[PDB]
Design a binder for this molecule. Sequence first.
Ligand SMILES: [Zn+2]
Ligand SMILES: [Zn+2]
Length: 304
Amino acid sequence: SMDVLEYFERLKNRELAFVLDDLQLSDMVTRRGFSVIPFDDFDLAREDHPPAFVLVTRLDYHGKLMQAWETAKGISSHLSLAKFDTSPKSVEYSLDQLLSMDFAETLKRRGDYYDSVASTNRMEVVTPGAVLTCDFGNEIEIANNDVEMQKGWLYSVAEFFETSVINLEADRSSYTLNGDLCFTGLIYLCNRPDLKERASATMDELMRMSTRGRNVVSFVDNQIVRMELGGVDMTATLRELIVGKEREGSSTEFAMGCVEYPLAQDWTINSVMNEGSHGIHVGVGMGKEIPHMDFIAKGAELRI
Ligand SMILES: [Zn+2]
Ligand SMILES: [Zn+2]
């Protein structure tokens, strides 16, 4: 059972089997010094298989990987970009971001942030013109927090870049949000091709707006009640895409990014890498009938 830092040092040193699902992306990966093997040729089931990094670009392959979880018997994480933007531009950006960052530095902030959620009942997020409060319940649901990677467990890399609390069982099974959050940009995640066809165009509009000025999201009783992007109120567009669907405005994720990205971020690119941006991000939607939006505030400071 390999240690997480042991895993990523090998990733930095190109000592991992790079499993790839779209071979048209092979040249960009091999140009970065990795030996690539197609997805359908790597035996995740064999226990002696070498420690692997899987890049899933396609939703059908994202499903094939999920089919192999209970059968997996070795060491593997995977960067799942199938549910975000899967263009070469997004893929090159995601890999450049991952391969440039300081992993050990990221994992300790992550460890420290979990040392903060467990102890405290209240968190205050201060952004330039806003303050957000988070009241953790007595029973919080969290994303996998293993620091030594277990055998047969398919780790999503992203969960190594953030400390994430989520309201999965019910609307407020873990935490409640009241107040405002001024954020930098956003990403959005869709689990189905049906949803991605409907919302992607709109969500990309919202992302580009986020570059044009003040971004602010407001919560009352853990329900999103206002969404300002580029200094303009878009709450009407928010309601059209959440009303009458799933839990509507219920916040679904409260998480803390732990990555000091050395390379410039691009907030027009819907890549999961941006969710790990050092700071705070809030989640709305489950990616089923509403895209799971993540309003990400970078330089945000925390208060207990
Ligand atoms: Zn998150
Ligand atoms: Zn999220």
